[PDB]
């Protein structure tokens, strides 16, 4: 019945065109992310190379500033505008105020820019959801998330994309109150979490970590293959 407008309400108080934007997020590849003691980590799945293209232009993980990362879902066009806009704000903040940009400040900019972009008619909202991970604000690891309605929010372990309900239910029975120290253990938690992929091919995982002091460290498909081997080593205790 009545939706076809972002300014009208339902007879029971809903915004269906805002709610339909979250349905476009569920067509994307899943991406998870946890925070740890010092090393934060986020991984993505469903690479699926097609035998005839270069793979350095299909990247889903980018950095806004020197100590903040980004992972998204949804459709690829609307993510490029939000990424390119957020690089300007996290650089123009440094010019007006000489501090580095906190991880909390950049998520309020993305949410508020998506906020006013929902209110006026003739402005189709962004059909993306994002994960902002950064251990930037004075040695403290944090990770937030966004929403197409424009609500920034903080979790401690996150999953999005096509099949987030299984992974988020998986991590509640898996994320121990025992803090995952010896950070390869924390990386092995993500590879165990990403092991419940839509097909779990093993070579379709692109994990990216950050040791909170260096830059981004994109893992190679030889170090990640070693972590996939030790996951099968712990699986030998079932018999």
């Amino acid at each position: 019945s009545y939706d076809r407008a972002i300014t009208v309400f339902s007879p029971d108080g809903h915004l269906f065109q805002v709610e339909y934007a979250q349905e476009a997020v569920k067509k994307g590849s899943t991406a998870v992310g946890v925070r740890g003691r010092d090393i934060v980590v986020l991984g993505v799945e469903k690479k699926s190379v097609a035998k005839l293209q270069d793979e350095r232009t299909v990247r889903k993980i980018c950095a806004l500033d020197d100590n903040v990362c980004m992972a998204f879902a949804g459709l690829t066009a609307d993510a490029r505008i939000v990424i390119n806009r957020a690089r300007v704000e996290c650089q123009s903040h440094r010019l007006t105020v000489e501090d580095p940009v906190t991880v909390e400040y950049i998520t309020r900019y993305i949410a508020s820019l998506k906020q006013r972009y929902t209110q006026s008619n003739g402005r189709r909202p962004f059909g993306i959801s994002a994960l902002i991970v950064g251990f930037d604000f004075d040695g403290t690891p944090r990770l937030y998330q966004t929403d197409p309605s424009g609500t920034y929010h903080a979790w401690k372990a996150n999953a999005i994309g096509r099949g987030a309900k299984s992974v988020r239910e998986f991590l509640e029975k898996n994320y121990t109150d025992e803090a995952i120290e010896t950070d390869d253990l924390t990386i092995k938690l993500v590879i165990k979490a990403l092991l419940e992929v839509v097909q779990s091919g093993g070579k379709n995982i692109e994990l990216a970590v950050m040791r909170r002091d260096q830059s981004l460290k994109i893992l190679n498909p030889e170090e990640i293959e070693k972590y996939v081997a030790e996951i099968e080593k712990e699986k030998e205790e079932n018999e």
Binding site: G13, S112, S149, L171
Partner: protein, 228 residues
């Protein structure tokens, strides 16, 4: 047609404003009580996941050092209201060297909500409760998306607010104390929600004349739960 964006009913109100009241019903419940000793306040967080961080959900914010707040309904529209409510109390101190009164805050807040349309778009979906201690003692106010602004002595809004206000009018009288009214409010809370009442479900907010500090109790609230 069937009463679209801006068109009168054959009988009464605009239905866009009428449907804005219904959007508050899917919010979270909250109770504010005015007492001559001060203003106490409570809310339910509605935390879904353990991985979901608890202290990221805000419902009580600090408009100023003597003015608290509470919200329900749409979180996305409430961040716009809290923004200029902090700004125009700060503009008042800039040009008058004095604190803006609690009533005249929401005068400026209710001007901006009655501005939907194409004139220089949609109405809001969020109700508010404002606690504060001005020169006339402690006060408590409430607004709606229709701009209808009124003073209350004890008010509960959000989901299950109808059943809250029935029992709340029995337990209230004019000679309450602040230590009595806090435990009088959370008895109403655990009778309208379904989870076990612990230190992670609810949070409190008190403001006093002599204690303009501390609008937010934190794990001293654990003592109040075990006393009841």
């Amino acid at each position: 047609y069937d009463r679209g964006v801006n068109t009168f009913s054959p009988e009464g109100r605009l239905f866009q404003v009428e449907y804005a009241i219904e959007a508050i019903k899917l919010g979270s419940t909250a109770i504010g009580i005015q007492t001559s000793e001060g203003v106490c306040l409570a809310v339910e967080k509605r935390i879904t996941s353990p991985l979901m961080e608890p202290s990221s959900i805000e419902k009580i914010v600090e408009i100023d050092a003597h003015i608290g707040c509470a919200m329900s309904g749409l979180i996305a529209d409430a961040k716009t209201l809290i923004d200029k409510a902090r700004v125009e109390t700060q503009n008042h101190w800039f040009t008058y060297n004095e604190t803006m009164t609690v009533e005249s805050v929401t005068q400026a807040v209710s001007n901006l909500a009655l501005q939907f349309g194409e004139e220089d778009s949609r109405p809001f979906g969020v109700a508010l409760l404002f606690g504060g201690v001005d020169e006339k003692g402690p006060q408590l106010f409430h607004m709606d998306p229709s701009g209808t602004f009124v003073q209350c002595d004890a008010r509960a809004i959000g989901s299950a607010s109808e059943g809250a206000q029935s029992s709340l009018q029995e337990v209230y009288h004019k000679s309450m104390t602040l230590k009595e009214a806090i435990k009088s409010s959370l008895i109403i809370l655990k009778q309208v929600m379904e989870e076990k009442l612990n230190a992670t479900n609810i949070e409190l907010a008190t403001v006093q004349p002599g204690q303009n500090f501390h609008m937010f109790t934190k794990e001293e609230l654990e003592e109040v739960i075990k006393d009841i």
